[PDB]
Design a protein around this nucleic acid. Structure first.
Length: 271
DNA sequence: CGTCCACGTCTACTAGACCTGGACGG
């Protein structure tokens, strides 16, 4: 559930549902504290887009669909285990907490938002989270400007490894990407963030925040979410150079999140 | 049986909380 996997997921939904027509209600598992989706239509299509660590679904009634319904948008955050699967209607995984059902001509499938630990959330209304910065994958220059226009922000007083998690500037970067990013430039994870960014007012740190997650999108698959057996899991593991790898150091940032790295921890290291 | 760890917010006062399950230890 970092930016690459959000992106992959929206693109899986678009592709797998290209030719599906959904129908009926949208069903929530009972265990879920996320809201019920009040949405019913006899014939609708589902599409998606990603932004950072969020994804939006649009549910779009076809012409003449009943009952009446204007398109509806839902935005999802994946937590630590969210994902989407398309499965046979009677063979629902768990823990499929939100389900959309295909309509008759065809084998009965379900598009499921599947989330074991349940840190995922969805919101009615199709709005990106206020406060999240632009997507490092799809909004690169806006991302770069928002970081650079805002270096006085106290966010940047922190270690570069911590600032990379801050979704107000690095929307889409998570724990694995930060290790990978920093590793490509040997930037110690505990250099002050502002010092590493001030250089900018061969690729630099802000370019890698885009181009590194992009690499993962280009592997295709499920990225970090991909299961061992794993044709795509072995890919992702083979792509990783630093995160969890033998040889590397690791330390806890101040929020208890592990940062992996090689070499100098950097001036601000908890000591 | 256990303890620890995981791709991330979220919110009540920088810790806990929120969850399941895999790996490994005894």
């Amino acid at each position: 559930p970092e930016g690459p996997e959000l992106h992959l997921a929206s693109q899986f939904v678009n592709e797998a549902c290209r030719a599906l027509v959904f129908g009926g209600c949208v069903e929530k598992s009972s265990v879920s504290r996320n809201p019920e989706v009040p949405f019913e239509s006899s014939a609708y299509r589902i599409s998606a887009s990603a932004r950072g660590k969020e994804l939006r679904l649009i549910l779009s009634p076809l012409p003449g669909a009943q009952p009446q319904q204007e398109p509806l948008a839902l935005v999802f955050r994946f937590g630590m285990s969210g994902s989407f699967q398309l499965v046979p209607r009677e063979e629902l995984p768990r823990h499929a907490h939100l389900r959309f059902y295909t309509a008759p001509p065809g084998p009965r499938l379900a598009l499921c938002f599947v989330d074991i630990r349940r840190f995922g959330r969805w919101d009615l209304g199709g709005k990106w989270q206020p406060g999240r910065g632009p997507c490092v994958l799809q909004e690169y220059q806006q991302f770069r400007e928002n970081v650079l226009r805002n270096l006085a922000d106290k966010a940047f007083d922190r270690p570069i490894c911590e600032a990379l998690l801050d979704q107000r500037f690095f929307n889409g970067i998570g724990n694995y990407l930060r290790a990978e990013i920093l590793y490509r430039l040997k930037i110690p994870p505990f250099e002050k963030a502002r010092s590493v960014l001030e250089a900018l007012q061969n690729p630099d740190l802000l370019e890698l925040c885009h181009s590194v997650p992009k690499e993962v999108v280009q592997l295709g698959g499920r990225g970090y979410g991909s299961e061992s057996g794993e044709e795509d899991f072995a890919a992702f593991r083979a792509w990783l150079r630093c995160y969890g790898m033998p040889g590397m150091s690791s330390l806890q940032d101040r929020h208890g999140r592990t940062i992996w790295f090689q070499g100098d921890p950097g001036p601000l290291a908890p000591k």
